[PDB]
């Protein structure tokens, strides 16, 4: 679909039996989710935002469904004010910025 | 244009006389530029995201020109590590997310 920016680009994601609300963020390199448990081993990592750095726990090749478009990839969880779908999973569903 | 997400969506804008490279971002509520000295009255404010809050000087009715589409709106000048174009202004050129 085409989404406009009068409102926040917020969409429903299925990340394995759970429905979540996340922002389609092209200003984000990665995908960071609010603290949840996702099956698998995790590596502790470090991303940064406008506020500075935060420690994350890194989960690899995890399937996410974004408004029925399928993606599979790195998905990070930590202390984010919202759930952001980064450019890493956006490219998999093929999203582009039009204007 | 039609911009892809394989690389950060960096574009040229012009502020004051400054010709700059800003990041297009659907995950930004506001536009944030790194320190620069624009003439004008301002108000401080705090903007946040991964890593917490940072203080910024808020300028009103500032003409900007994003890849040949001009706009006018609010602009936050603060110690941010990238120039960011938020939906405040994306909405004015007619940027859309499409997948």
């Amino acid at each position: 679909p085409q989404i406009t920016l009068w409102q926040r680009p917020l969409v429903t994601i299925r990340i394995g039996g759970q429905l979540k609300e996340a922002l389609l963020d092209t200003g984000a390199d990665d995908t960071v989710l609010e603290e949840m448990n996702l099956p698998g081993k995790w590596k502790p990592k470090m991303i940064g935002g406008i506020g500075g750095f935060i420690k994350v726990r890194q989960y690899d090749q995890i399937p996410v469904e974004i408004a029925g478009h399928k993606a599979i990839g790195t998905v990070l969880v930590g202390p984010t004010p919202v759930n952001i779908i980064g450019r890493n999973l956006l490219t998999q569903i093929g999203a582009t910025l039009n204007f | 244009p039609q911009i892809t997400l394989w690389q950060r969506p960096l574009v040229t804008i012009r502020i004051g006389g400054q010709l700059k490279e800003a990041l297009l971002d659907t995950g930004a509520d506001d536009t944030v530029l790194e320190e620069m000295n624009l003439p004008g009255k301002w108000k401080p404010k705090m903007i946040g995201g991964i890593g917490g809050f940072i203080k910024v000087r808020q300028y009103d009715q500032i003409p900007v020109e994003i890849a040949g589409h001009k706009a006018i709106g609010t602009v936050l000048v603060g110690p941010t590590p990238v120039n960011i174009i938020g939906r405040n202004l994306l909405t004015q050129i007619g940027a859309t997310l499409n997948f």
Binding site: - | D25, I84, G86
Partner: peptide, 6 residues
């Protein structure tokens, strides 16, 4: 990485 504004 960098991950972006509220």
């Amino acid at each position: 990485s960098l991950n972006x504004i509220x």
